[model samples]
Target: ITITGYSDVLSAGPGETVEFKVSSKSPHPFTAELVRVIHADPNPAGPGMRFEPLGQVFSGTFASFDKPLLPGSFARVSGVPAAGSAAGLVAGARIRPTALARGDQCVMSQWNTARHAGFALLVSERGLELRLGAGTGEPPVCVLCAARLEVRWYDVWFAIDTASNRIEVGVTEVDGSVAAPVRHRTLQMLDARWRAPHSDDAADLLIGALEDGRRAHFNGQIEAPFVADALPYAAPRASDFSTDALYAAWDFARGIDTLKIADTTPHARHGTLQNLPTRAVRSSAWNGRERCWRTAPAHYAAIHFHDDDLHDAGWSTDFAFTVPATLKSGAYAMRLSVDGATDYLPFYVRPELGRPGAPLVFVAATYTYQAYANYARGNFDAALRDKVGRWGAYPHNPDDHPEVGLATYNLHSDGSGVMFSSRLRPMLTMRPGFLTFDDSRGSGCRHYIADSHLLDWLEHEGFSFDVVTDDDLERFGAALLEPYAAVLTGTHPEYHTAATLDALAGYKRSGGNLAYLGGNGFYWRVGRSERVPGALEVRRTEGGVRAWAAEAGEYFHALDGEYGGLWRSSARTPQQLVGVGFSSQGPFEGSHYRVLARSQPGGSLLKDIAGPLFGGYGLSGGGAAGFELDSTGTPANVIILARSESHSAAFGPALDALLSHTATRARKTPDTLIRSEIVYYETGYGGAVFSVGSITFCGALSHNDYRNDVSTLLRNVLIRFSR
Candidate 1:
């Protein structure tokens, strides 16, 4: 897919505007056709795929450009003159370099790479050094402090006297203690012929990266750095000078919430951050005292910058669209195509706020989509691509393109779990025909493409419903869902904000019927801030299935300062809301559920309308109760409707479900704690809940062409809940 793009906003109501940032390598212009995506399953054997052309105002053969993406985090400030004074200037910072072997990196510099001018604090093959150039585009000379710098906190300071060409570099290794104890080592290098660069063009000071060099970025955390009007000639150690001697000071702690890097002295010189660095990080003084940045912001003043950290693509908008006031609430996309290559940029259109478009609202798992956007699964091969080609699935995989940005499920180049995922980049896995697995038995779909199996069923069965995304529900609260008689969730509404969960609970308590059609919902707690919109921050602190664990002192989110982990860790377990919590998981396979005696043989709630047994067939894993399953917990008033049955040695309980090695003995056996369940109960208000606790539940809705028991059961629930 040479033609790719992403929308600025996920879900927008009618009359709201949305912009699209596109990238195309093709020389020919790309045509845009607006379509409402009803179904996105690329499996030809199943309900094919349908994208109804809406023919809106955003239609044209527009001129296209490559509009590339530059992913990295750094800070930039101006008003700092280049070092060329007769009297020396002092420059330094408190840094913790994570990856030094990745090659040359700039810690803090006011250098121009084009002319190779100005002095810079850099870590090259010669180790942490101070580079000095004469702004004549000549090779810069450096004095190395050591052959290598350890991966720990250090206050690296450097001073240069151009009048005498004398250079001094020093480092104070902070060993995370405070008894007037820290190893300080200052070294004096012999006279150097070259003087400091004095170019006026290189006046901007940069942290974590160079001015013009691509890929030359420091992957680490950086604290307060400053340039002072040189200390006295006999200043032995790097100590505090008088305030009158200060040139400029960038205090990272002052604006911990925004992108602004606050400057204390030097006449109000400030700068903005680029590419969204991880702020509120532990600083040099941090010693596990307080976790929240709001409590002790000074201790959490550092900013962790990564080469792959991207908040927004900052791409030039090729085209923009103001949503039509009468547009239907559904999953929509702008299909872009050149000569042959094509890309589908998806966006959602929710109904007007508090105005119901239908009796029910189908919640799009958008937070889940963003959390797993451009996920690098490392499973693509000719075997899977063969099926993808045959099925016409999405051709671009994240593994093939890491520049598209990172997902929460992926790790940074330094092997740290990706904490934040933004929606401003091309998310390939969220495409309509995106395939995630090489399933041996069924359509290998996950997330967006997988959730389309349910959406396709709804369209095919003529269900009158509106679509609301997880973000929309979060912004508008339960009142947005209050008008709907019933609400339904997508296949995997896993990652959610605290506001979204609270909204669901309020909607449920206010007598709204909820059909938790997906498993593993409300599993992880997420953070969202108005200061940093379009990004989701999630830290895998502990418990539940995860890609990677957060570091010991980094379990709190920088966005909202929430204890980042499973919602159950915060006492808002899934069972309390949906009557079931995640219990177990296995390979992508399926099995049928047996009707329990508690399910009355009628069209009531948990009516057993599917007869003896249902959910024995469809796309994902070939049956409803496949892959991840949720069971174990339910309210005492809830009645068991059905229980999944299967035989597979791979099926096992969740890691959190076990007490220890001894508790693992009773798990994973046939009909043990590994099977999925269907339960139902009524709230004191007119509310009712019917939970089909399986990730593959909606994958079976298209079985027998929507004539199967899974479809019938869900239809009956929606009908009765609305009545």
Candidate 2:
């Protein structure tokens, strides 16, 4: 029997509840063991994956349950009353069109129970078209507003007076400029095919898209859409709309950060904005003065709804974890074993606020893990699959299972950049044994798997430490790190939020020792949602080694209205905090680091660990400095302890470096700018920083059974920092 599960919450503290939902193919009994996950790396060359007992195992018998799965992308609002003879519909929208295809892109729609009858306002590359269909299977009545309406904001109004059997439509710009005159047409309701505006309880009333057995999604910004019972000849404003004729008026600016769109009319017909649409965006009425939604909600009264926005899976809960107060804070997992099928649901437990459980803390790169989840890099093929199979690597690849979801690195089915990624679904790549690269020299590992090498070495050296996640640092800010004497980052801590960056910087300034044990750290500026906690938002604007780029004028994030791009672009480069920034990227294969001759007789921290030749072999890419590498940047009183050399020609300068054109000469040489530097520096208030400027540095710790020079060097730093 095969079993798979996921947790509703990624990390939880004491006195909090975490829900675990599992699905089993066959009815069987399973045992759940809460174990402290010391090292989750399944790399055979490294110290094999280890888990220590955290709590007593719990056994439970589960029977298969018939639960229906519903999946789609659309926003829905119910309680829409049926239209009478005098009832009419009026809505105003501002659209920044994406797709210029000939198919209909729905702006607003209402479908009848029979599915054949409906009313919809659609926009295409040709022009704006209004469709109203009767009960008959014949073609619906279409009124075309033949104007090119792509990439611009246009306001439209539709009115249907059944008493006169007439329909009136008007189109105008947001600034009160007319594209064309209002068009009126009379309908023939004399035949048996004609049906009154039918509104069954099961009917659908949607915005930005329509559901008529299939989805006709609109891809653009939609603001200030409403429905009415009477004809609205003039433009309607949210503050001045009359309630006597108003059915429902949605104020998108009211709830800028929530999924609930508020209704300003007396009917109280609230609606849900589904699929993780971009909120707090600039509206058509915006005049470019106010940038923050909280400052001026009316100016930012838009929701940039994309066709690919996804947030939650809405799955049923299978189990819950009410963490015991006596449980120690650390990296843990719920191991599920059912008839030889095994799975581990990993989670981190944090200490209580203002409580110090350990002097050293390991900060897991949870944001980076979420950003790269289900990443289908188009490199997986038959050859790669065969290699992975030969190595006994993780079986399930993302290309084979698209139902889970795609990463931000992937494009949507419609060829748009994926801006949102959620962790509510099964993150197969984040689990143990999931390999990203099939290395020829070592046990190929990346991200979560690669970070385990450091954890394994720490456990082997008999060091006791607490575990925290990037999410905790982002949520709790500096307070989360204040209790710890030292903080150690995971391998490739690339993605970070504004709060977490400030917290780490603040911790360093306030006398907390920092060991940056990774490369390409604090790279991207991602946005997290409190309303939907499991998802992250990113916009790949300009200047980054990204899979996709954001569209023009869409560079700012709709989640927080902040400019989306690299953190270095915002003047807060990684060097300002860690003494190094991303410099270059090359093949997964690695090379060794050489201790600097100037630092041979340096300090006590490098006494027994420092050597001329070290970190020559690792479980990831064979050596320490490979994959992504960092170089020295602006730092005061920085000491370059060691550096890597002889990088292959595959190593190219970073995009930012190339853009600056200052390092053009170094690009042609092997021992130039394409090198990782091990740096150390002292800060104010007795704090200090030690940085290893390579993504594969941590993976070298488990070499030679944790007795290698790389392992010894890190142990030396950790011992002194914890003191």
Candidate 3:
């Protein structure tokens, strides 16, 4: 029969001796050796904790010692059964240690490497004791360290048994502190089992802490129940007293009425460090706001939370101990007091360590005033007229100009022949100049203001314009401003430059606000030899404006640094950093974007907005909301504010809500409100380039397009971020 026993089964009360023995049923004489011992940290009564280690003990052969099968003698024996091997008398078998012994002269082995042989045993006397050292003036170890020290005590017990032939082990709770009620009670005990001299049974005996009924409790589950519950001190040591004493000290300090200071000033709160010296609890106050009562300091290492509206009462508090450099080099005992309850935590501290400093800013760009003024002044039209004239004879008068207002109508044929709307005007109107105040192009506008139908509507609706931008930032400041705080883009900003991307990176790093009001911004890196449209030929080997330089067979074999070829490299940066990449795919007509996730907690934002918008569309009243539900490629983190599931999509209520929200948000936080900085990175295609992956995301707000879903989304993003 296999009988199992646990190691370090009982802790003798202070000033008592613990005895151990083994037992087994095997007729053949078997020898056992007790080997290896360890100790664990202990938990103090109040809130402190710490751990320590005791040295290992080793022993050999059982028969030579003349040790009989004592009631508590742990033993593992080897010998053939009376029935023989054919009758299930397997070789290298495992059995309980107690009641088994080595009849002949089998040498005993340690528990570390013993293979399966026969019966095994672990035994300990119920009442071993030792005088404990005084804890006065002793430094307190951390709670985790104390717990580990308790384990060390058990290790010492195991070492003693390893030297003996066999021993029985039992684990029971012992209460030494006068404060606790349930004193002197045995919680559990394990019987001896079988195994080889240095085998599995011995190993199992050593790790008995995890066995059932081994938990420490206090006062019959009363105040601070994590401490020991039993009384009559089964076993206690100086280490245990010291550990509990430390905990009690901390607890007393943290108790509700421990201090009697008065808060005489407005800045002083009940939990503030200033109030700790007055009317306070046993808790300690650090420089920062964290407050501790009985819990360990390390427990609050990483406090994470999600708040839909952080500015509105969305805050959580945690407590941690800032290990000071002045402290001695040793394991410290502390409590992690969160909210109320205390959890003992033990931690080690080293003198010195180092970490890299905060990241640096690389560039800044302002996509505002000058760029918008240039468009408003019709410079693009002038360039277009000059370019078209080179190809063929063309009329230059205003009435005969090929491209017109709102539509960006093309006059490729004669005055009114098959005119096509390019849908590019909205974006052009939103671009900012290189500087907020610098009007190199002589446009009569501030670098901050850009053309936006929504903004115009807000102005018309009586909202004051308090936002402004610097002239130097106009070129690509949109990137810099957006990352740290709110930034605004116009109705559309299709055309962009390398500088634009650098500015975006600045905005993102600085934590500016950003919003894009258009699609297809920064789509290409087209360099201009001259400011005029046709006069400026694209600087690519491929020669055609539409072809990406890399896609064509022509490589940059000759003219390399003179100009940057196609493929706006900044887009790649945003893809890697902010998880957004420009798609040149298509003008998928009349499709409605589905709402995947919303920022509002419990989805209040989406419901309020989608309900009215979808209602306007015939789909709302019926179960058929919106259309064009293509959510497959959408990123998991993208919040879908509203969703539509139809192909024949229409944006009535949805569009209005989106526009209104964007306008309102922009009014609160303007583009100029954001500061700019620059950053550089590597790309798969472009060797080394800069990325404008700023936080503001202003590209969407720079344009105005009734038919553009991207523009609307950009506007909404701006509003959400600014708020």
Candidate 4:
């Protein structure tokens, strides 16, 4: 009924084999076709995705229920309990505790304002505890079960019967590991105040956290919780619970791809999820017999909700292609087709390292792409949503698809920085036509899509070039660049590992022409796992425009045990390598640039261009200089060819300035240092360096049908350097 897949790696060299893993919900045959991707822009106005079939189709069929379960992931619901209860309430859930520490961790709660009425199920080192409360000024009643529960499944429930004036609690071990006795506690209520409180607007009913905003986030698997107005006499399974007196019963597995948590009760009080929790996880009831949730939904009904959950997918090889040794190196993919359903699994092919090939190479910023993959900037509000609908932009926003996983820019449910990111999962944002922001003046492309403009320009110019990825550069270093005369970077190449940076520096020093075509390049320090390929780790500690800050002692990465933060903090500043570093950032709008009189010596670099005033219109933000910008630093010998004028007041100084001890109030305004500089310098061994210090620079390459100054300037450099 359904089919999907992913590749093991993002790139491969000639004669190297790359693997593909596929999953199908039904036993259906599928065909695969290799295709060369010349262009990948999805906009009809642009040179849309052009594919040339490289080989004949190959067919195969996968048995049903062959897919593996993704562990350590869960779903989350955000909202308060529906306000209908008058007498008492009952709550029940199945839990599988994987870890337990000293503090209290909540499984589920109806908590809101302090001193308000609510109920919560909490787990601690001692055991499970049920806390029931009345109105303000009334203390809550706690029922504890003193049993050591760990690494096992158990059922827990609490019921308050106001008609009988009795409260009952029960905990039953369901793992069948031992003959442990079922723990039950009963409390006869003598006061009329023992009744449960009705839902209030100030409170929220949360599955993971104590309240929508507080601590005590759960760290294990939790099946669907059931809520009712009165006791059912016995703790019933989530599926068996009747809908007569039910307040709300959330079924997480039902809507696996959406952000809406489905409520099975007739009340239809569906809730929204936040912070991007994981989904498609193995439930506690999974008996290890069935491997797929689609086969037995009830057995896999649980969601492993963690304060910090990651979805790596972690699939193995389904098929592989060994690149032909003589084939031209560029972007390619396995185009799969089944019953009119087609999907492209994109990957890059690089030329043989240290061997003859195309003289020009474009280094794809895969690290940056992975870092910002599915980045939910918390800006997907009604205004942006309406704009997207009006413009017919990318419809599947990350805000509506939390199942794909969160970007490194998002924080974990426990308020920790998301340090690890992997490319194994479906990166919806990296696909063609995906837009991150709705720019008022230009196209809303950000990372991958924005970078494609340069690629499309290259194709339009009929330049034969090889494509290399950040992962390849990190592994092969300067040897990968040795074969090419000139190397170009992608737009917004922000994250880099040490190996890649060092290799790039070495390449520039060794007479290799280097063109930094993008802004905010090599800003953050990220590490990749040697054991677990495709996984990257980063800690946002020493500041830059960061989404979350690492804890004081937790700045070191667990993958390599290295101190993680900004590369500038480690002394290997981008200015030292590229002559410029990150200086400022603003909204997705752009302005023009001005040629400096002092740059007469570098006038030959722009000989094909007409005037000093250029790059005023394009697809991204309408100009070349905008978004994240960089400024010249340290090196006095670097010649500034052109510099952008003062940006709008919306453009502010970077976090680097905020943390600098020498910073003063005068540095806050539209200072000269906040502007982007187009710089040129000669390195040792007859090499040359050209840096465009703005993320939006490449977006202008396709303006005026590739006749703009931005296009001419880059083409002139490419031709001169290649020769």
Candidate 5:
């Protein structure tokens, strides 16, 4: 098997014997120079120091050298394996300057159900040197999942600080970019438990002890040293940021009369901010802006939604309302409405006596179709009632399941054999493959099935409503906000029409509070049959490249024009709402979350709730269960007014926790435990914030009668939003 180094922490000092070992499992029959280790600078472009006779080690052989490492600020090694040994084998280890020339050797072991035959690296001193190189053997996995090769050297910057000592590790990419600092102890042992793109290429670092304080020695052309460390960090390259192009397209789609770009931070600094302002931009026409001076005050607010993908369960809306005028003077009850309900949010608007105007702040949330989209995309199998079972075997696309959307996989197991542990029948059930579409329409077929299934489930969940097609104040009337609020959604709300997004935006702009309930909501610019609200038509060409908003009959066919698609980043208004400019981390959980704030009194909408969830929970366990199932127990925000007793039913503590979180965010009524947001159409005025971090709030909407607590929560949201 292949052998690699320990953590990327490599160090060397004068007058010290550098001991290192080559580890392997079931060594080859004959002695072979598996790895040719060379000394280089901290980066890959530094000068290389070639050694003497190439070292030859057989199976079960623990070799070491008592040579002194040269005095250098930073030294690294490169390893080239012997030919014909094995394909994809990587070798490296941690190195350190010590008095002895021996340390831990390779030992046959099984990790994560896979046999891992390698050595462990241990450093006696705080500062040590190490390098990584491929050995004359086959690696267990590919570079993406090698566990041996440090794919993105930039992420390897870390440090380990023990009570006695502290060590810092630095990694330099092949392109010469160096990471900040990484902990040496953090990369000591290889964690095979990490899934796909992470664990596969993880390598075990080795730190060998030194016998004498020699300066230099070697076996053949291979440089022998004290310790060997593997590279740590999985960094995404430019190719992964393909969506940036999509956003660029969006900018052109919208009117580009004037384009102004400003860099908020200094050019040399890392903290940089780019701001773009579009004139005459209209997501929806609200009344607040028209009557700003009379009704309240002019303000600029930012709404925050968890997922940019806008397709996932438990998605909620969050917003920060900023009003520079009234915010500077006194306490005011900010009446924020989204969809159709109104929430009287309390905040202190600081007044500016003689100084510049201060921005008023009011953070709130919304309950919208996006939340349902996230739920539908995330819980599609459940949404389909087990119709399409297993998710296909696509390579490591994303393990986090952050935002909602379709992850297309073309395989027999594309939709079959899912593991469901329900309170009703808590056993593994074999799910038969249903008749799903093939790639006949290219990727369209796959997207169609996934999207269709999601929409179908949402329809079944009672969110099957129309997209209020009224020009100005025609059909909505006074109760428009009320009717607009109540609908809950499933995961994967991918198919949004420009009109639909505009309608919602208009509603919010007009003093309406929108609770974005799902991830990736309003992200893509799709064309749907004007006659059929659910029928979507997207045109994708070869290489999976798509032109956003191309007209097809009644609706825009595919997204095209200057601004990529309506869903293009540039077309998206209100950068203050969504944190990042674009969706970055996906298919992989970036951070775990817990509730941050709580609703007012009587806001406990659901029982058995938890709260105060943080973003870093379960970050270390990237290879665990799927995104939806990987819970680091209940969160704090959920616990505010909810119970947390585990039950034997499908909707138990977890479901209860989700409902409670939703209620707290939506400011549900005590009697009905329902919450909603109203979408008004008053011109320029806009501001509100809404939040929900629960998973099963929709379970209540799945049924009509408020039999379950979930249903009660759904009812509360709907009726509350009703004008």
Candidate 6:
């Protein structure tokens, strides 16, 4: 749509308000109407989309206005403590600039860009410098230490000495070696005939950017930034850095799990961090000793601030709706339309507390949706545009909308992987009809929209089911699963936090049946902080198939101070939860599965759907068992009911798959062929597990008007489990 928006809440029950924040660009007002989303895939080759309009519940014409995206990450303190420190002042931090562009970059600032007063430390073309103003209207003085800085640690500081009437800046290089603790120390001083500039007493203190975080933003690691009232003769060292006259010292090591900069002095000058920066990073003091921050806080003491960090757009709510009490709990959306454009802002209606509307609950993959939001994959070419136009699919793509925040899967311009994502911005990837791949064999959907195929299939089978999101699972825990007979997962439920994983694990342990209908579930570990609401933090560790690698010694999440990356790295593989783990990935094409002679006793109806070959056709890749696949490794507890066959040459083992005892340095290349598995297992308690481990499995549910073997397999499992 010419309009774009996001809801403050991913899901809500009756009487709870759902707020929508929209930015409209239109010549005329746009109309909004509510609709129950049954099928979002508009593929003409499959059962087409069906939506029931509920205009009476929500219908209105809204005003239009453009909202700008204020994108940058920094930290802010309320008052400038050094503004009136006429005994003179010093501002310093450990900096390692990764990439440089035009103009002076402000590492920390108290200077008023409007009237040009106070002071700021900067990385300039003339090397490390400081800009000082007298507030008497003279031009700000610049003191420089003329040493070229690169992608290495340097203790950079600037000071004003009132007694000597001079301004000075210094630098001390520190490499990551215990022997070469100090590479060198240098300083520069100049007679700057001016008084202390405290003209802007009300100006807030900031680090990593200047006023409004829109200009002079620094992109690099900043550590132990501080301000003091006394000037020192020698270059500062972390070992002997004096806090005798410290106005405020920000200890980035203190709150490693939050967006707070703990001021170590009595003034309580705590600063709130904006646009979440990567924390739990190795600082200048790190000496290859400890790997975990929880053990040695000082070793992981840096906050890596970037110019492109945008945790939230902070748009105001444009409209609101209170879901009707009688509305069914399932997938829903607010349909927005104008004369020239259209958009579907999708959300969910989860069941109310203590209310059991159905025996089954579909857990929506909201975390995975956030991880892949607004992903610009550079695949929307001419052919894709023509196909989308012909099919009346989503007209907008992430490539065309640069203002929407980049997905966690994308690397920043400075080449660092984006570690955090916020739901406060427009989630272009979660809307109906949004395409992730320009597929020739399927609808090309992946996250939110692709998962709706399950919702539609459940509706088609006349099953009354309630929806609960992954977010709720994180907040409520396993107790939320007590009422339901069986729990279901959406396709690509890959990204998760500790709470989400524990909830599912506990539910399974307590005899709650589960059907994991997706490949690569419980893959990546992510975290959240109450201080940083609606945002998630993920640190790609040393391994796994990742878009970008984490910088060395920065493998812990800032939000929770936990080791991140693959959940398997934490010894919680999907095999322990759903009886399979990610095995391989191939082209966007499907392969048929061959039923095997099973050793475990499955339900009686399993034989009715059993055949030598099944899942021959689907809306996804033209077959069920295609795309991303999982394998069982033939676990003792897990029974493989069937295995996919005839995989294409593109199929290959997962990058992180482990080598067995028989494997060696070059052991016959380890047979590249891999396949999906439909497995079954029983929990000690009356619970059971069923997994169709392929991302494209659910895309075949509506094949043959919901009468296909894939559909039959799921129905048999669900029906037996619900009993």
For every model shown, the clashing-pair count is: 0, 0, 226, 2, 206, 0
Question: Number of the top candidate by TM-score?
Answer: 1
Instruction: Tell me the TM-score of each prediction against the true structure.
Output: 0.93, 0.85, 0.26, 0.68, 0.25, 0.91
Q: What 10-residue stretch in candidate 5 is worst by lDDT? A: 421-430
lDDT of 1 at 651: 85
What is the C-alpha local distance difference test score of candidate 6? 0.80
Q: Write the per-residue lDDT of candidate 1 for residues 1-723, one digit (tens) a residue.
A: 588998888888888878888989989888999988888888887888898886654677889898778888898886656644446677888888888877787888777666666667876545678876654645667677764566777777788755555677777766646454344444555365544444454468888887655457788888888876566422222247566656667778887768898878745768888888888777877778777777788888798888888778888888888878877788889999987888898888889877888898999988899999888888898899899999988888988887888889988876667888988888999898999989887998998888888888888877888888988988899889999999999888888878899889999988998989988888998888888888888888766688998776677787777878998788788888998888888988878888875434332644536457777886998888988888854577777778898737888777766666446424444336688988888765778888888888988888887887888888888778777
Worst 10 residues of 3 by lDDT: 216-225
lDDT tens readout by residue for model 5, 1-723:
122111110111122111222222223321222221111011111111121222322112233212111210111111211111111111222211212122221110112213332222222113223222222244432111112222122222222223223233332233343553332323333233121222343332211111112112110000111111111143222222233111110111122122211111122101110111111111112233432211221111110011011111111112223333322222222222222322222222222222322111111111112111112222223323322222221111112222113221110011211111011100001001111211111111111112222222233344433222121112233233333333222222333445545655565555554433323333444332222222222322111112222211111121121222335333553212221111111122222333322354325343333443322211111111111221111212222322212211222111221334344222442222111111111123433323222222221222222233333443344334433
Evaluate all candidate structures by whole-model CA lDDT and list the values in order. Answer: 0.80, 0.74, 0.23, 0.71, 0.22, 0.80
Give the range of the ten consecutive residues with the poorest summed lDDT in model 6: 664-673
RMSD (Å) of each candidate, 1 decimal:
3.0, 4.5, 34.0, 14.7, 28.9, 3.3
Q: Write the per-residue lDDT of candidate 2 for residues 609-644, one digit (tens) a residue.
A: 646767888788889888889887466688888888
lDDT of 5 at 199: 32
Give the higher-lDDT candidate: 3 or 4: 4
Q: Write down the lDDT that model 1 would get.
A: 0.80
| Candidate 3 C-alpha lDDT tens digits along 372-420 | 2212233435554453333221112223321222111121111211111
- Predicted structure 6: clash tally: 0
Decreasing TM-score order of the candidates: 1, 6, 2, 4, 3, 5
TM-score, prediction 5: 0.25
